[PDB]
Amino acid sequence: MIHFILLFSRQGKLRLQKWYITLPDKERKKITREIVQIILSRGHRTSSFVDWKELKLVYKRYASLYFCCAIENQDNELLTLEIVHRYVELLDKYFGNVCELDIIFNFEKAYFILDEFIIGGEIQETSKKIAVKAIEDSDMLQ
Amino acid sequence: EMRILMVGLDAAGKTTILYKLKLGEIVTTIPTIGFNVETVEYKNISFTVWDVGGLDKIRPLWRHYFQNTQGLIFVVDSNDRERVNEAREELMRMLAEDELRDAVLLVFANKQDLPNAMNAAEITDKLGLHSLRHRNWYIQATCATSGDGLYEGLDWLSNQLRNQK
Amino acid sequence: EIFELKAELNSDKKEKKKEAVKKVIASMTVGKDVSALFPDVVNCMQTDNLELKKLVYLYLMNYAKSQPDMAIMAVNTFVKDCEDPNPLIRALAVRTMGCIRVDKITEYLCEPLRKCLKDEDPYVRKTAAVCV
Amino acid sequence: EIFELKAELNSDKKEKKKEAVKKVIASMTVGKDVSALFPDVVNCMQTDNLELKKLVYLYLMNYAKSQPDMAIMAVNTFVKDCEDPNPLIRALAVRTMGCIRVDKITEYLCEPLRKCLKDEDPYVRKTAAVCVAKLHDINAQLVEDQGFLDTLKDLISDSNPMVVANAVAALSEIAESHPSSNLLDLNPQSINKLLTALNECTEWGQIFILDCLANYMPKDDREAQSICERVTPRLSHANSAVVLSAVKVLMKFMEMLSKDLDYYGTLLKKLAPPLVTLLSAEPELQYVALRNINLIVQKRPEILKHEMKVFFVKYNDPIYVKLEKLDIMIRLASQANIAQVLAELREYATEVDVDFVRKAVRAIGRCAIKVEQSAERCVSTLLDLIQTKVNYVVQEAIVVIKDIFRKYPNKYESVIATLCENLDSLDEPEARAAMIWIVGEYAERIDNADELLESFLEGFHDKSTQVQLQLLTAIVKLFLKKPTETQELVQQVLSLATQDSDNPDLRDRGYIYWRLLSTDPVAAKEVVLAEKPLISEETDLIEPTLLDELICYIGTLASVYHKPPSAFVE
Amino acid sequence: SASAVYVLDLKGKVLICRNYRGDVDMSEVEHFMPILMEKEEEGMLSPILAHGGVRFMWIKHNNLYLVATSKKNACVSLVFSFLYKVVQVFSEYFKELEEESIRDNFVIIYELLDELMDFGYPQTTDSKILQEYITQEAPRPPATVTNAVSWRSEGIKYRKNEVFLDVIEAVNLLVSANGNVLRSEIVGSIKMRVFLSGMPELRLGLNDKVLFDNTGRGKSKSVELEDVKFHQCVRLSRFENDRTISFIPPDGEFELMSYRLNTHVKPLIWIESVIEKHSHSRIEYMVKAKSQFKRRSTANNVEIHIPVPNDADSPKFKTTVGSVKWVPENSEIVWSVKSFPGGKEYLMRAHFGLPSVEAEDKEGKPPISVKFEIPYFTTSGIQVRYLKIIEKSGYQALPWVRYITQNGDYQLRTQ
Amino acid sequence: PIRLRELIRTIRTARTQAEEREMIQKECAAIRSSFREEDNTYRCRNVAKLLYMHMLGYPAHFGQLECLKLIASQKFTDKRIGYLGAMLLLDERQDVHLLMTNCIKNDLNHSTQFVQGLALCTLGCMGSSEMCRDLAGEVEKLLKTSNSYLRKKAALCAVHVIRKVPELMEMFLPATKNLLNEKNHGVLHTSVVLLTEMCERSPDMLAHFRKLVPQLVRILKNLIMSGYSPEHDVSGISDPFLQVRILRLLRILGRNDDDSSEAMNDILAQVATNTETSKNVGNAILYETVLTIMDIKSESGLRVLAINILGRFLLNNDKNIRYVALTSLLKTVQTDHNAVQRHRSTIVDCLKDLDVSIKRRAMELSFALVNGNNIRGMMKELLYFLDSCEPEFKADCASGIFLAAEKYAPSKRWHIDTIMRVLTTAGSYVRDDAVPNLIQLITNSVEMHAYTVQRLYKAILGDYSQQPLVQVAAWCIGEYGDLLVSGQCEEEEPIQVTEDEVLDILESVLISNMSTSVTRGYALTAIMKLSTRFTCTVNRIKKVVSIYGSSIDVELQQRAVEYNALFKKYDHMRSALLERMPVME
Numbered sequence A: 001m002i003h004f005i006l007l008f009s010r011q012g013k014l015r016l017q018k019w020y021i022t023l024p025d026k027e028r029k030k031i032t033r034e035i036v037q038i039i040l041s042r043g044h045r046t047s048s049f050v051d052w053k054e055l056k057l058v059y060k061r062y063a064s065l066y067f068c069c070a071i072e073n074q075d076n077e078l079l080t081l082e083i084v085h086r087y088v089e090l091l092d093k094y095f096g097n098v099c100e101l102d103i104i105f106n107f108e109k110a111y112f113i114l115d116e117f118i119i120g121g122e123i124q125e126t127s128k129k130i131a132v133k134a135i136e137d138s139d140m141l142q
Numbered sequence B: 001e002m003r004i005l006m007v008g009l010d011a012a013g014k015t016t017i018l019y020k021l022k023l024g025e026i027v028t029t030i031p032t033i034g035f036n037v038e039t040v041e042y043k044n045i046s047f048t049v050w051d052v053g054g055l056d057k058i059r060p061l062w063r064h065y066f067q068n069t070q071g072l073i074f075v076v077d078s079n080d081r082e083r084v085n086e087a088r089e090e091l092m093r094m095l096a097e098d099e100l101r102d103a104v105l106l107v108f109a110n111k112q113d114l115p116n117a118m119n120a121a122e123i124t125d126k127l128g129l130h131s132l133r134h135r136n137w138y139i140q141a142t143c144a145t146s147g148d149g150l151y152e153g154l155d156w157l158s159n160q161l162r163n164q165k
Numbered sequence C: 001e002i003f004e005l006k007a008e009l010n011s012d013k014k015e016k017k018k019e020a021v022k023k024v025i026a027s028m029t030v031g032k033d034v035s036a037l038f039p040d041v042v043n044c045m046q047t048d049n050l051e052l053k054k055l056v057y058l059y060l061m062n063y064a065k066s067q068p069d070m071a072i073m074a075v076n077t078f079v080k081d082c083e084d085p086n087p088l089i090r091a092l093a094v095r096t097m098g099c100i101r102v103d104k105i106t107e108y109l110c111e112p113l114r115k116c117l118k119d120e121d122p123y124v125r126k127t128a129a130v131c132v
Numbered sequence D: 001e002i003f004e005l006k007a008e009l010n011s012d013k014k015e016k017k018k019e020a021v022k023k024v025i026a027s028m029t030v031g032k033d034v035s036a037l038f039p040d041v042v043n044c045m046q047t048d049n050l051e052l053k054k055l056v057y058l059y060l061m062n063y064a065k066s067q068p069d070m071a072i073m074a075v076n077t078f079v080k081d082c083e084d085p086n087p088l089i090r091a092l093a094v095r096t097m098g099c100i101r102v103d104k105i106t107e108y109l110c111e112p113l114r115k116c117l118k119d120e121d122p123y124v125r126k127t128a129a130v131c132v133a134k135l136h137d138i139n140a141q142l143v144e145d146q147g148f149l150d151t152l153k154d155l156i157s158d159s160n161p162m163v164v165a166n167a168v169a170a171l172s173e174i175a176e177s178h179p180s181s182n183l184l185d186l187n188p189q190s191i192n193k194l195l196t197a198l199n200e201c202t203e204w205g206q207i208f209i210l211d212c213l214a215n216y217m218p219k220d221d222r223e224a225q226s227i228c229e230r231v232t233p234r235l236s237h238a239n240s241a242v243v244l245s246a247v248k249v250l251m252k253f254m255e256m257l258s259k260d261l262d263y264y265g266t267l268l269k270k271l272a273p274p275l276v277t278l279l280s281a282e283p284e285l286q287y288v289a290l291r292n293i294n295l296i297v298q299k300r301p302e303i304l305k306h307e308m309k310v311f312f313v314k315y316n317d318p319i320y321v322k323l324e325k326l327d328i329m330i331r332l333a334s335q336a337n338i339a340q341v342l343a344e345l346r347e348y349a350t351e352v353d354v355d356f357v358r359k360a361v362r363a364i365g366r367c368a369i370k371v372e373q374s375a376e377r378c379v380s381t382l383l384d385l386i387q388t389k390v391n392y393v394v395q396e397a398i399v400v401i402k403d404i405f406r407k408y409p410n411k412y413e414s415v416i417a418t419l420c421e422n423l424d425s426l427d428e429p430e431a432r433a434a435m436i437w438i439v440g441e442y443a444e445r446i447d448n449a450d451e452l453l454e455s456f457l458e459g460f461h462d463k464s465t466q467v468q469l470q471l472l473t474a475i476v477k478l479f480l481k482k483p484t485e486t487q488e489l490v491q492q493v494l495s496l497a498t499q500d501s502d503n504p505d506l507r508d509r510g511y512i513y514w515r516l517l518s519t520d521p522v523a524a525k526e527v528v529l530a531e532k533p534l535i536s537e538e539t540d541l542i543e544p545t546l547l548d549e550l551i552c553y554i555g556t557l558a559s560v561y562h563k564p565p566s567a568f569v570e
Numbered sequence E: 001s002a003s004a005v006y007v008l009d010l011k012g013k014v015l016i017c018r019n020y021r022g023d024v025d026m027s028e029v030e031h032f033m034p035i036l037m038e039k040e041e042e043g044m045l046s047p048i049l050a051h052g053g054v055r056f057m058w059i060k061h062n063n064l065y066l067v068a069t070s071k072k073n074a075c076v077s078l079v080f081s082f083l084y085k086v087v088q089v090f091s092e093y094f095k096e097l098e099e100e101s102i103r104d105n106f107v108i109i110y111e112l113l114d115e116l117m118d119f120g121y122p123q124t125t126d127s128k129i130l131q132e133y134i135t136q137e138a139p140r141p142p143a144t145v146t147n148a149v150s151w152r153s154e155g156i157k158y159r160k161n162e163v164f165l166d167v168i169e170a171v172n173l174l175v176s177a178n179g180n181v182l183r184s185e186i187v188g189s190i191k192m193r194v195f196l197s198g199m200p201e202l203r204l205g206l207n208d209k210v211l212f213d214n215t216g217r218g219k220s221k222s223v224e225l226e227d228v229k230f231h232q233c234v235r236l237s238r239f240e241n242d243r244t245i246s247f248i249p250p251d252g253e254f255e256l257m258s259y260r261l262n263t264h265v266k267p268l269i270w271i272e273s274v275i276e277k278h279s280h281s282r283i284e285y286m287v288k289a290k291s292q293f294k295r296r297s298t299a300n301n302v303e304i305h306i307p308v309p310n311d312a313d314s315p316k317f318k319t320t321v322g323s324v325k326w327v328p329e330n331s332e333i334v335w336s337v338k339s340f341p342g343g344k345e346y347l348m349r350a351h352f353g354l355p356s357v358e359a360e361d362k363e364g365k366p367p368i369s370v371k372f373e374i375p376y377f378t379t380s381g382i383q384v385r386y387l388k389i390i391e392k393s394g395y396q397a398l399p400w401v402r403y404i405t406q407n408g409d410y411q412l413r414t415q
Numbered sequence F: 001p002i003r004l005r006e007l008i009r010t011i012r013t014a015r016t017q018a019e020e021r022e023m024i025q026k027e028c029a030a031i032r033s034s035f036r037e038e039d040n041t042y043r044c045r046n047v048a049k050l051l052y053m054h055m056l057g058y059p060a061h062f063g064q065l066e067c068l069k070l071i072a073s074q075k076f077t078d079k080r081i082g083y084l085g086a087m088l089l090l091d092e093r094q095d096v097h098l099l100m101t102n103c104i105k106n107d108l109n110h111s112t113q114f115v116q117g118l119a120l121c122t123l124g125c126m127g128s129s130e131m132c133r134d135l136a137g138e139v140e141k142l143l144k145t146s147n148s149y150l151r152k153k154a155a156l157c158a159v160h161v162i163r164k165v166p167e168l169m170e171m172f173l174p175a176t177k178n179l180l181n182e183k184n185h186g187v188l189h190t191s192v193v194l195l196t197e198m199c200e201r202s203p204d205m206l207a208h209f210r211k212l213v214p215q216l217v218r219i220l221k222n223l224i225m226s227g228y229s230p231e232h233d234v235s236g237i238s239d240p241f242l243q244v245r246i247l248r249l250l251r252i253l254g255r256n257d258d259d260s261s262e263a264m265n266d267i268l269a270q271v272a273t274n275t276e277t278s279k280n281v282g283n284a285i286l287y288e289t290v291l292t293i294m295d296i297k298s299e300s301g302l303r304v305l306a307i308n309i310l311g312r313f314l315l316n317n318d319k320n321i322r323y324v325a326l327t328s329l330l331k332t333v334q335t336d337h338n339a340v341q342r343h344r345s346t347i348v349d350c351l352k353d354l355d356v357s358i359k360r361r362a363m364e365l366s367f368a369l370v371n372g373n374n375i376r377g378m379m380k381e382l383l384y385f386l387d388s389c390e391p392e393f394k395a396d397c398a399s400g401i402f403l404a405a406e407k408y409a410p411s412k413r414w415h416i417d418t419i420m421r422v423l424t425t426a427g428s429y430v431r432d433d434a435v436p437n438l439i440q441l442i443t444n445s446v447e448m449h450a451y452t453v454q455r456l457y458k459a460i461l462g463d464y465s466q467q468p469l470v471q472v473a474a475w476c477i478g479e480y481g482d483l484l485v486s487g488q489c490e491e492e493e494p495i496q497v498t499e500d501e502v503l504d505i506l507e508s509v510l511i512s513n514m515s516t517s518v519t520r521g522y523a524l525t526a527i528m529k530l531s532t533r534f535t536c537t538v539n540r541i542k543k544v545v546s547i548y549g550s551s552i553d554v555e556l557q558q559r560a561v562e563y564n565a566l567f568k569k570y571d572h573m574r575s576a577l578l579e580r581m582p583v584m585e
Ligand SMILES: Nc1nc2c(ncn2[C@@H]2O[C@H](COP(=O)(O)OP(=O)(O)OP(=O)(O)O)[C@@H](O)[C@H]2O)c(=O)[nH]1
Pocket: B009, B010, B011, B012, B013, B014, B015, B016, B017, B029, B030, B031, B032, B033, B052, B053, B054, B055, B110, B111, B112, B113, B114, B143, B144, B145
C-alpha cells in the first residue's frame, strides 16, 4: 500500500504532494521536510531504497526533480519503481516532452493523471493507453 | 526511436513494401527519383525509414544520408539475375566505407510470388553474405501485396536495435 | 560551427530540426555560405509541417544552381507533395518546381505539372499556369 | 579551456595578461580550480600596475598552501617590491608575505620585514607590525630567533599611535601565543604613554590598547584611579566595541578602588547609563551585550537594580534577544518592581513562540523562588495562565507551581482545590508526574485524590520511570494520609510495581514500600512522612573564582558562553 | 579575531571569501546553512553558530550573510562591529548591496577587504579617507590614513562654507494594553552635513542641565542629557572635563552624537481602540487618535498601523480624517493622515469579516506602531546654543539647524 | 481575479520567502474578498490558486467551503477542481468533510461515468470510515454495474471502505463472486488487489477464495504465455503489475494449504523459468515468484531452484538486486534456515557496502542468521562492525546483538563477555529498554557475579558518561557489593576492591552533572542497599544522605528524606527490608 506520493525538486521545492494516509498538515510538513532532507543527502549508488520509519521507501532520480513514494514493507519493491516509470510515461504521453515548466504551469493535469491512474494507493489502470485516452475524453467533455 | 534505410536496386519493390509497412496498402508508385521517408511505430519503437532509390544517377547520392546512420536495409530484386551482379557490386561499393559500420545489414528477398525468384538461400550464395565481417546480416523472404516477411525483418531489426528485455 | 547545425539537423525531433532550418535560412538571410548544408536539409524536407517546408523551398530556390548534381534527391518528394489533400502545399510544390532552373531536374517535371493543370481548385491551376 | 587562458597569460601585452588574470580571479571568485595556473601567473606578477598585483597577491594568498613547492619563485620579487618608492606596494607586499603560510618560504622573509619595520612611513610600519604577529603565527620561534619582540616593543615606543596600536595588537597576539615566558607587562610610564596614545589612535586601535590592559593589574589606589580617570571618557563612544572593552577594564580595575572613597561610587553611577544605552545598539551586538550584562549583574547586581523598564522585550526583537531579556529580568527582579515584571510576563505567555512562553513561565517560577514576597502573586498569575488552558502552558505551569510548592509548601492549600481540574488529559510526562506530586503531596485537602489516579493507574506499565515512580510514592503518601479509602489502591500499585514490572528502581522502591507497609505501616508516619527540610534550590550564580576569570574575558566567546576559554577552544 | 571573512548568498554558496590566518579552512563554510537551518528550526537561532571547534559569527543583510569564522577565542564585538562597519562602508560605496555588486564589481571589493583587515585586525575603517586612495575610476596612501586625525584630510576646499545641523528626535514608547506607559525614553541623534575648507575645529553649544549646573544657570529651560555617546572625532577627555564637544569634523555627512534620556512628558499621539472579536464573523476597530502636544505643530505623514487578523476579508473603514490602505501582505492597516495637527482627535472605525472555519494555529497579537514625523519641534526641548568655527584662515561659516521629531519604536500594545 | 498560472509566475518571480509570503498574502486576500462576493465563475481559478498556495504550504483552510460549493456546482470543470480540492484540503480529521456525503452520493448517481469516476476517486482517496458507512451501499451498486471505466474504480473504492471499515467487507463478498474473467486487465488488476485485501482481512473469506485458485492459475498462465500486448507492456511483459498481484494473492493463499499450493505448483515452476533477470521488471517478477514459493507450503524442489535464484540475486552488481537479495534472505529466515546459512560470507560481505540500507539489511540479516552454532565466529565480526559503525546503526546493532545473544548464548560467561564488550563499545547509543533486560539476565545468572561485578568495576572506573553503562553498574554495585568487596570489614592487605572508592565512584557520578537523575535514583538506591551489604565503611554514606536531603530534584529529595529517617530513626528496620530482590521472568 502506497502511503504517500511526493515530488520535490533538487533545491527542495515541493512540486507535488499526495497523502493516502490522513495525517495533519503540521505532520505533513514534518514528514515532507524530513524525507526531502533524507533523499537530497544521499549519494548515487545507494539502490534508491531507504528503510525509513517502518517504510521501505521507494524514490527515484529521473532529473533534478526527484520523485518519492513508500510502499508497505511487505510487498515487492521494484514494482513501485515500475509504477513511477509508468506514471512518467503517462506524463510524457499526455503532456508531450514533459518539461519541468509543464509540471510547474500545468500541475493540476498531473494531479488528474495521478487520479485516473491511482486511487487509494493502488493501480487502477494498467493500460498505458486506456488511462490517457480516458483523461483526454474527460478533457473532451470539459 | 532508431533510424534505418531502405536501399537497393530500382524497381525492386522497396517503396511498394514501404507503403505496405506504413499504411497497409499497395499504392501506385513511380520509379523513385528523389527519396521517401515515413515513420512506423512498431513494437513501441518508431522505425524511422529513409528510402533511397536505385536509379543509376542517384546511386552516387547515397553518402549524404551516411552521415549519422545507424542501420541499413538492402532490398534485393530476386527476379533479375542480370542485374543482381551489379547490385552486388553496388552493395560492395556501399559497404566499403569506413563510416558505414554500425549499419547492420538486413536483406529483403523481394517479389517472392513469381516462379522465377530465388529462395531466401540462393540470394545469400549469389551475394556471399557469409564473408561479412562486422555485419549483423539477416536475409528475409518478403512479398509486397501480401506483406508477409516484412514484419519478420522488422522483428529481427528491433532485436538488433534494443539490447534489453 | 556548421557541424553543430548539421547535428541539430540530423536529429529526429521536430523542434530541433525546425530551429536548425530557421538558423539555415537566417544565415541565408544575411547571405552566409550555407550552400554546404544542401544535401542534408534535402532529407529534412518531407514534413507534415507546412510552415517548415516553405523555408526549405526557399533554400532550394536559392541553391538550385548551387548544387546542380545533388538536387536529384527531390523529384519523388515533389511528385508526392503534388498528390496531397491540401492545395496550398500542392501549389507550393508546383511553384517551387518551376523556379528551380536545373535542366537535369526538369525532365521528370512534366507529368505532375500536367496533373496540377487538371486539378479542381483554381489556386493550384493558376499556379501551374504560371509554372508552365 | 585553461590552455587558452595560459596563452593569454604567456603573451607580452598588458591588456591581454590583465584580462587573463581577471578571468583567473573570477574563476577563483566562484571557486573554480585555477590552482593549476599557479607557476605561470607567478611570472606575470612583477608589473608596474598596482591594481594588477593586488589580484596576484590575492591568488598567492588563496593558493599558498595549494602549491607549497612552486611558491619559491616569489621571494626575490617580494624583497624587490619592499624596496619601492610607493609605500602602498611595499606594505601590500609585506601583508602578502605574512599571510603566505608556507614554512619553506618564511625562512628568507625575516630581513625585509625587519627593514619595513624600520621604514619612515607609518602605513608600512603598522602593516609590518601586524606582519610580525602573522609570522609568529606561522613560526613563533623564528620570530624569537630574529628578536622581533624587541622591535615590537620599539614600535610600542613609537610616535603616531596607529603603529603603536597595531604593535599592541600584535603583542597581545604574540604574548597570547607565548607560554608567558618573558611576559611583556609594561611599567606604568609606558602605560601612561598608551594613555597619551589613546586620544589619538583609531577606534579599533583604542580597542587593542585597551586589550593590553586586560593583562596588567595596577598596584595602588591612586595609580588605578589615575588611569581609570582617562579610561572613563571612552564610554561615550558611538561604537559599542570600544565601550565594551572599556567596561571590561573598568570591571577589572574596580576591585582595586576604595569603596569608601567617592570615586568608586562615581565609577558605579557613571557606568550604568552607558550599559542601558548599549541596549539601543543593533541587535547582533545586543546578544553579546545581554550576555555581558548577565556577567556584570552577577558580578555587581547593584548597577542595574533600578533599571527594569529597559529590559522589556519588543515585538521586533528576535528570539536570542527576547530569551535573554527574560534572564536579565530574572537577575534583576526585586521587591518593588514586582507589578511591572509580573504583568509584563503575563503578556509574555500570550505569544506564539512556544519556547519563549515556556521560558516566560519558568521566569515567573524563578521570580517566585527568588523572592518570597511576590510568590503569591506569581501563584495567582500562573493560575490565571492555567485558565487559558493552552496545553504547553499548562505543561509548564504544573511543573512551575510544583517547584513553588517544593520551596514554599506553607499557605497554598486552597490553591490545589482548583488544580484538581487542570485538563487531566495532560500528556507530557514531566508534568504528569509533577501533577502526581501535587496530588499525593497535598492529599489531605484533595478529597477525590483516589479516583483521579485511577486514570493515572490504567495505562500504568508504559509511561516512564519518573511518572510510575511518582505514582508509587504518591499513592503510599495518600494511603498514609487516608488508610480507609485507598486500601485496595496501595496494594494494587504494589502488585503492579513489584511483580509484573521489570523497571528496576520502580521494582526496588516497590519492594521497599511493600516491606515497609508489611513490617510497620504506622512507622511510615515517621519514615516517609518525615518533616522535609527547606530545599536548597539551584542557585545559578557563577562561581566568583570563575566569575573573576570571566571579568578578564568580556567581549570574548567565553564571555558569551559563560564558560572558561579552554572549555571550548582547540 | 576572525581568520576568514565570508559573504554568502541566501542559499549558502560563496559570493565572496577572504581568509587571513588559515585557522578556519575554506571548506568549512559549506556547513553554515545546514547549521543555520538546524539551529533555526529549534529556536536556537543565534548570531554565533558552531561546527565542532569552528565558530560562525554572522550578521544578516537582505540577500547577504556576512559570515565571520573563527576557531580560537575571537574578540566577538570586535568582529560584529567590523561586520557592521563593512556594511556601512559598502553601503556608502554601493548604494544597493546585492549579488550584482558582488559578482560583477569584484575588482575593487577584494582590495577593500584586504585593506580594511589584516590577520583579523581592523586597522582603517573610515569610508571617506578610503575613497581617496581606493578608486574604481594608484598614488601613495594619504597621510590622513597615517594621521591621528584620520577622518578629515587636508586639501578640502569649497566655495561657500556651510554647516548643516539635523536635530532628529525619536520617541521610544511601549504603552501596555491597560493604558499606562511602561517606558518613555528618547534616543536622540544629531547628524551633520559639514562643507568646510581645510582642518576646522568645532565646539558645539547645547542647553545641557549638567553643564548649566557647572555654570550656575540650571533654573531656565534645559535638556537633561542622561547619556551621550559621541563619534570618535569628539575629544572625549575634554567632554569628561567640562562637557565640551570638541571635534575636528569629518567631511560631508556624519552623525555627531547619539544621546539617550528618559522623558516623563505624555506621549505625542495617544491611540485608544476597542476590538470586538466575535467568533467566525467579523472584527471592529473603533480606534481614536488624539494628540497631547501643543496646538501649533502639525504631524506630517503619519502611518498608524493596527495589526489585523491574517485571513480577514471584505475590509471596511468608516474614517473621519485620513486614508486607509489595508495591507494584508503584512496583515495590517495603514491609516495615513498627511496633515495631522496638534490638539485634534481623528476617529477611525474599521470593520472586517472572518472565515467561518478556524485556523490550525494561532496568529499572535502585535502592538500598534505609528510612523509620525514632526518638523520644527523637539519634545525634549533640546536646543543648540552655538557652534564656533575655528580656522587658521578665519571666516564666517553658516551653522544652520532644523528640528525634527520622528519616532523610534513607537509601540502601543494591543488587546 | 488573476489566473492560476499568473499566480504561478508571480510566486516564481519571488526570490526571498520573506517577500514570497507577501506575494502569497496579496493574492490570498484577493481570493478572500472574492469569496465574500459568492462568485461562481472565477471560483474555479480562485480555488485553484488557493490549492497552489496549499501545495507550497500556505493558509488555505478557509477555502474548503468553496471546494464543497464546487462539488455542489453543476458544471464538469467546477466539479473536477472541487474534487481535487476535496482530495487536497480535506481529510479524516478536517471535521467539515462530512458534508461531502450527499454531494458524492448524487454524483455517484450522476449520469456521466467521469463524474461518477470523480465521486469514486475522492471517496477512494480520502473517504472517512463514517463516509464509508454512508456510501458503501452505493459503492457496491457501481460494482453491481459493468462499466469497465467504473468497475476498476469501484473495486479499489471497496478496498478503501474495507481499509476504513473492516467490518463492512461482508457485503462485498456477494459482489466479488465470479467477476474473475473480466478481459479488461485494469478491472482485473483492481479485482486481484481486492481479493488480496479480502484474503488479508478475514480467514472466513479464505475458504471462499482459495476455491477460485485454479481460475487465477489459468489467468496467470494466460498472462505469462501472452508474448506481447500493445498496451500494459513494459519490457516485453503483458501487464506485469497484475502478474505480481496474482503472485501475491498466490503468496497469501496456500501459505498453510497443501492442495492449493500444489495447484499453483506448475505456474510457479514456469514463471521461475519464463521471467528475465535483465531489466528491473523481470527481476521483480522473479523475486515475487520466490516470495510466493517461500511463503506457501511448496515443494522443496521449488525451493532448491529458488535458493539458486537468490544466490544469483546476491551476485548481481545492481544495488537494487542486492537490496532485493538481502530482503529475500530476510524473508526466508525460518523457511529454509539451512540453505540461507551458506550465503553467510556474502551476507557479511554486504556489511561493507556504501549504503545505509544495505548495511542495515545485512546487519539485520546477520542478526536473523544467528543459530546455535554460528554464535562464536559471527559475533566477533558483528561487534567489529558495531565498532566500525555510524551513530545511526549503533542503536539497532546494540539491540540486535543483545537479542541474538539472549537466545543462542553457548556460555553464560561468554554471554556476559559479549554484553560487556557491547556496553563498552556502544555506551550512550543502546536503548534504555534493553537495560532491564540485561539486569534480568544477569540476575538470572546466579553463579557468576564476582566475574560480572569485578569486570563492571574495572570498566566503569574510567567512564561514567556512558549513561546506560552506569544504569547497569549502579544496580550491580548495590546488589553485589558483598561479592565485589569480599571479606574486607576492616583494613587488610591491599586488594583492588577498596570499599571507599567503591562508594566514591557512585558519589562522583552523583556530584557530576553527567547524570540523568535516574542515574542518581539508581545510585542512592545502591547507597541505601550497601548499608547492610557493607558493614565495612558505614556512617559515611549516612553523611551523604543527610547532606543530600536538600537536593533540587523532587523524587531525590523524597528519596533522601525517606532514607534519612531510616538511617537516623529506624536502623532496626533497614537490614530487615534489604534482602535481594526476587527474580521474575
Ligand atoms: N508481381 C509482383 N511484383 C512486384 C512485387 N513487389 C514489387 N513488384 C513490382 O516492382 C515494382 C517496384 O515498384 P517500386 O516499389 O516503386 O520500385 P522500387 O523498389 O522502390 O524502386 P525505385 O522506386 O526506383 O526506388 C512494382 O511496381 C511492382 O510492379 C510483388 O510482390 N509481386
